[PDB]
Amino acid sequence: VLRFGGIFEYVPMGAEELAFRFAVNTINRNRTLLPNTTLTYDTQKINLYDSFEASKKACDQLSLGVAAIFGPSHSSSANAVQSICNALGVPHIQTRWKHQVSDNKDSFYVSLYPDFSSLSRAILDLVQFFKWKTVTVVYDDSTGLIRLQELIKAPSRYNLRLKIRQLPADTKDAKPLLKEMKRGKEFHVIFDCSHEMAAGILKQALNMSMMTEYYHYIFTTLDLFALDVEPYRYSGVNMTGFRILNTENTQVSSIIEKWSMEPDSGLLDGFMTTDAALMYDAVHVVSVAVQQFPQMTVSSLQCNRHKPWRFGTRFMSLIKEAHWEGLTGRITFNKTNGLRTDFDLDVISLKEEGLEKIGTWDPASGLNMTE
Amino acid sequence: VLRFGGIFEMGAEELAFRFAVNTINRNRTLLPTTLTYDTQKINLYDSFEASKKACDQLSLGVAAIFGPSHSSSANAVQSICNALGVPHIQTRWKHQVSDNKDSFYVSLYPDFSSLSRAILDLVQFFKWKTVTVVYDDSTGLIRLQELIKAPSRYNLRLKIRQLPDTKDAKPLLKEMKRGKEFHVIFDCSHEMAAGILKQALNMSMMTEYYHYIFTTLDLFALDVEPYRYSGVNMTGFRILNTENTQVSSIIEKWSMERPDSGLLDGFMTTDAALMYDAVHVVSVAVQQFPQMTVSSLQCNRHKPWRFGTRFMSLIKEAHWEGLTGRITFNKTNGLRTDFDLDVISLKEEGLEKIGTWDPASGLNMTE
Ligand SMILES: *[C@@H]1O[C@H](CO)[C@@H](O)[C@H](O)[C@H]1NC(C)=O
Ligand SMILES: *[C@@H]1O[C@H](CO)[C@@H](O)[C@H](O)[C@H]1NC(C)=O
Numbered sequence: 001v002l003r004f005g006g007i008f009e010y011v012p013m014g015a016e017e018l019a020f021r022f023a024v025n026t027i028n029r030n031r032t033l034l035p036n037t038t039l040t041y042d043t044q045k046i047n048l049y050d051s052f053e054a055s056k057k058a059c060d061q062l063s064l065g066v067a068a069i070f071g072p073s074h075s076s077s078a079n080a081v082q083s084i085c086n087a088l089g090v091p092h093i094q095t096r097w098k099h100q101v102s103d104n105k106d107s108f109y110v111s112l113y114p115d116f117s118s119l120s121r122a123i124l125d126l127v128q129f130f131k132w133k134t135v136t137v138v139y140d141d142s143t144g145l146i147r148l149q150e151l152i153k154a155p156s157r158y159n160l161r162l163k164i165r166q167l168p169a170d171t172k173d174a175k176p177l178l179k180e181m182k183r184g185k186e187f188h189v190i191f192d193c194s195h196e197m198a199a200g201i202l203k204q205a206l207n208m209s210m211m212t213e214y215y216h217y218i219f220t221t222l223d224l225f226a227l228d229v230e231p232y233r234y235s236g237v238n239m240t241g242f243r244i245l246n247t248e249n250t251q252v253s254s255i256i257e258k259w260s261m262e263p264d265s266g267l268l269d270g271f272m273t274t275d276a277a278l279m280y281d282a283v284h285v286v287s288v289a290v291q292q293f294p295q296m297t298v299s300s301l302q303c304n305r306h307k308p309w310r311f312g313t314r315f316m317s318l319i320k321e322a323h324w325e326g327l328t329g330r331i332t333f334n335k336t337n338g339l340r341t342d343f344d345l346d347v348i349s350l351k352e353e354g355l356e357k358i359g360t361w362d363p364a365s366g367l368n369m370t371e
Numbered sequence: 372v373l374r375f376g377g378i379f380e381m382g383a384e385e386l387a388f389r390f391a392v393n394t395i396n397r398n399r400t401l402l403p404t405t406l407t408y409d410t411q412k413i414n415l416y417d418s419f420e421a422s423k424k425a426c427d428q429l430s431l432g433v434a435a436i437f438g439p440s441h442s443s444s445a446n447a448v449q450s451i452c453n454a455l456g457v458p459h460i461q462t463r464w465k466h467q468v469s470d471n472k473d474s475f476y477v478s479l480y481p482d483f484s485s486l487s488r489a490i491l492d493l494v495q496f497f498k499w500k501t502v503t504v505v506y507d508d509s510t511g512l513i514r515l516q517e518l519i520k521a522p523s524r525y526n527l528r529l530k531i532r533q534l535p536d537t538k539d540a541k542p543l544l545k546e547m548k549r550g551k552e553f554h555v556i557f558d559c560s561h562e563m564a565a566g567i568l569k570q571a572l573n574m575s576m577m578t579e580y581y582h583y584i585f586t587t588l589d590l591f592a593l594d595v596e597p598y599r600y601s602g603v604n605m606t607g608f609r610i611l612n613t614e615n616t617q618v619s620s621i622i623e624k625w626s627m628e629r630p631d632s633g634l635l636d637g638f639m640t641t642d643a644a645l646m647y648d649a650v651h652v653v654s655v656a657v658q659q660f661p662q663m664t665v666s667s668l669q670c671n672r673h674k675p676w677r678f679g680t681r682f683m684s685l686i687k688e689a690h691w692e693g694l695t696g697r698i699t700f701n702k703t704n705g706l707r708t709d710f711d712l713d714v715i716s717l718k719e720e721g722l723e724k725i726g727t728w729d730p731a732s733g734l735n736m737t738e
């Protein structure tokens with residue numbers, strides 16, 4: 001019997017927090033996992049973008065005695081708990097993308113979120129398939145540039161002429177930006193934002209008769225198809241994106257169901273995000289690591305009192321090597337970056353019947369289209 | 372008599388800090404009071420060690436911490452400073468976040484959105500149609516983003532590359548030479564720059580066809596001797612007013628205290644000059660607040676700093692003529708968005724001021 005850690009936003013409850021609890025409870029029930037063990041956990045609710053509070057709440061979970069911390073979903077917060085985890089030798093489990101640094105030499109952490117250099121290369125692979133010559137990439141926050149940088153420096157190695165814009169704070173302030181694209185005849189567009197931001201801008205692009213067949217939008221969000229695309233079914237507009245969540249598999253469909261069993265924004269109700277799906281998978285991927293390490297026993301470690309974690313290098317090694325078929329498909333880590341650089345995607349596009357798989361992608365095979 | 376804080380990777384910023392408080396002590400005009408300080412040497416890119424060393428300086432009792440010169444390290448001490456209400460003094464650019472609501476901090480480094488707008492103002496003056504922007508690390512994209520999204524509002528067609536090893540820049544140079552990319556912007560440290568110029572030279576890439584612009588403000592602490600009569604054009608900016616002799620003599624007694632790399636020996640970087648100015652800009656704030664007294668504050672024991680909101684207010688309002696010119700802060704971002712630059716270019720006599728710039732006036736060229 002051992003304990004896990006968790007840090008989530010403070011507020012109604014969070015979707016990642018529920019995917020975490022729900023995950024350890026189905027690990028308890030399921031015989032195959034922990035036939036001689038039981039998962040308990042400790043939840044901490046911190047105000048995000050607060051490195052200090054995240055570090056303290058982290059140290060409280062460390063003295064309490066955890067085998068791994070599932071840190072916050074933010075840049076600053078996650079970097080703090082990542083450094084504390086690397087110091088005291090306790091594994092850090094990130095479920096989102098954060099800006100990494102070459103200088104940084106932390107090793108006690110892994111990220112289940114699909115390496116975003118693989119996704120940027122999948123996007124341009126999709127632009128190659130569409131034979132696009134021009135394209136306007138519009139991002140939400142500045143980190144978007146660091147994210148899909150492999151796409152930004154394609155025009156230098158390729159024959160591409162892409163403009164690049166950004167949208168302000170207000171959601172509905174996207175109309176002026178849309179006026180400039182409409183006016184600039186920029187029909188091929190990539191959007192770097194959350195599926196919520198996306199559903200919001202599509203509702204405005206619609207008001208600006210911008211949903212014709214001339215336009216073709218690609219989306220960064222993997223939760224693209226948790227969107228109510230009903231209003232744009234027969235508008236003639238094309239839309240494409242990726243999906244790492246294998247909802248095609250019924251095992252995944254039933255898990256998503258018992259999870260959803262527990263407003264007019266444009267989103268569909270009763271859906272599981274990839275952030276929630278990645279937290280659920282994280283719990284399972286670390287459960288298979290501890291499964292191969294029956295001699296595990298948490299320990300009370302203090303931040304002020306320097307003291308590495310006993311079974312750290314061993315546990316972290318079993319985690320970076322773990323291969324697990326989860327909701328998001330085959331899960332494996334780049335031995336160098338402990339970063340998930342190899343994964344399977346399903347390219348999907350809007351049709352007159354709705355969004356549907358038109359092919360697959362992956363860093364290896366490249367781009368396979370079911371013509 | 373009060374104490375200051377400092378965190379560094381001896382270093383040039385650390386010496387500019389000590390040197391700064393010692394000249395504040397000597398100089399009558401300031402502290403007619405005495406400055407003592409506490410130095411901490413942390414391994415950079417270590418949020419944890421930076422937070423602990425910071426809390427040790429907080430319990431010790433400081434009036435302000437001059438945090439580390441890194442993203443992660445500076446964000447940690449920035450959050451701790453905002454919590455315990457002690458002013459944070461950053462001297463470099465770090466990626467800021469809209470969500471972040473910390474207020475106890477200011478950055479003397481010139482707002483990099485003003486510099487990105489000065490760069491394109493320079494590209495407008497040169498009437499460049501094409502241009503290849505090559506950055507060093509990924510944060511460069513976030514930095515000069517105001518330039519990257521110019522092609523959408525303007526008539527510009529700029530490529531964009533990244534460099535990996537210093538000497539591994541040759542393949543990148545082959546692609547530019549081959550792609551006829553003569554107009555080039557470089558986003559890197561003056562050390563990286565001096566290194567790539569030495570290679571561009573070996574590749575007969577220093578002709579009059581090429582024209583390089585540089586992000587580094589320490590551009591002209593470079594040995595540009597080998598490219599004097601090569602015919603190549605080179606341009607950059609300078610916020611350090613070495614033209615002013617007061618600044619020239621300070622830089623001198625500084626270089627009196629402390630390899631074939633392409634750099635010039637005995638120079639003061641803008642990072643060191645900004646630390647020196649920081650100490651003075653915060654000294655003028657405490658000068659207008661004689662009722663100041665440091666306090667021992669604990670991290671585990673929540674307790675804001677008494678004269679925090681007041682001190683931080685006197686600092687964000689402080690106007691000070693320093694080594695880097697007039698220093699003032701954007702009331703909203705506590706970020707130095709208004710400053711004076713001196714555009715400089717390589718001639719047959721060497722680098723020299725060919726004009727000035729600033730967010731207000733725009734671009735003034737001494738034709
Ligand atoms: C679109 O939005 C405008 C306001 O921006 C509103 O006045 C108009 O009724 C809308 N047009 C339609 C028919 O959707
Ligand atoms: C692992 O990381 C290296 C270096 O970033 C990268 O080149 C490689 O593609 C990654 N591994 C895989 C198979 O994705």
Ligand SMILES: *[C@@H]1O[C@H](CO)[C@@H](O)[C@H](O)[C@H]1NC(C)=O
Binds near residue numbers: 573
């Ligand atoms: C440039 O570098 C090459 C390879 O090291 C060297 O052989 C050559 O002499 C250099 N060019 C000159 C003229 O210095």
Ligand SMILES: *[C@@H]1O[C@H](CO)[C@@H](O)[C@H](O)[C@H]1NC(C)=O
Binds near residue numbers: 579580581582603
């Ligand atoms: C560089 O400067 C000289 C000054 O005479 C100018 O004639 C030339 O056009 C410039 N080089 C470029 C980039 O054209």
Ligand SMILES: *[C@@H]1O[C@H](CO)[C@@H](O)[C@H](O)[C@H]1NC(C)=O
Binds near residue numbers: 701702703708
């Ligand atoms: C401060 O920054 C804002 C952008 O955040 C800018 O619009 C404003 O002009 C700056 N303050 C002034 C008036 O100098």
Ligand SMILES: *[C@@H]1O[C@H](CO)[C@@H](O)[C@H](O)[C@H]1NC(C)=O
Binds near residue numbers: 735736737
């Ligand atoms: C242009 O520079 C001159 C000095 O050469 C300066 O006196 C003048 O104020 C500048 N013009 C303006 C106001 O932009």
